[PDB]
């Protein structure tokens, strides 16, 4: 029967773990290098004669 | 009489103005590298027994 195999693994380096920084939809905003105000945006016009 | 005094000037260097990007309100929001957001801020508890 195929069996589903596993490998032989070493203890987790913790410079491989990543996932404990956005674990959590707050943590997804504190990763973020800026966050988006609604004083960054440029509404453009065309006005007409 | 003490008189005002004015030295002779040469034409200005565009390399000295820098005026033009902090005469506004909405500039000085502009210049800053990130603004402040209530979902940055953590408050301090201290629970009792």
């Known amino acids: 029967m195929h069996t589903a195999e ?3 693994t070493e203890p987790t380096e913790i ?3 990543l996932a404990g920084g956005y ?3 707050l ?3 504190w990763q973020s290098e ?3 105000t609604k004083n960054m ?3 453009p016009l ?3 004669d």
């Open 6 to 8: 596993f490998l032989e």
């Open 15 to 17: 410079s491989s773990v």
């Open 41 to 43: 945006l440029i509404f």
């Open 46 to 48: 065309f006005i007409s």
């Open 27 to 29: 943590l997804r905003q």
């Open 23 to 25: 674990n959590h939809p």
């Open 34 to 36: 800026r966050q988006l």
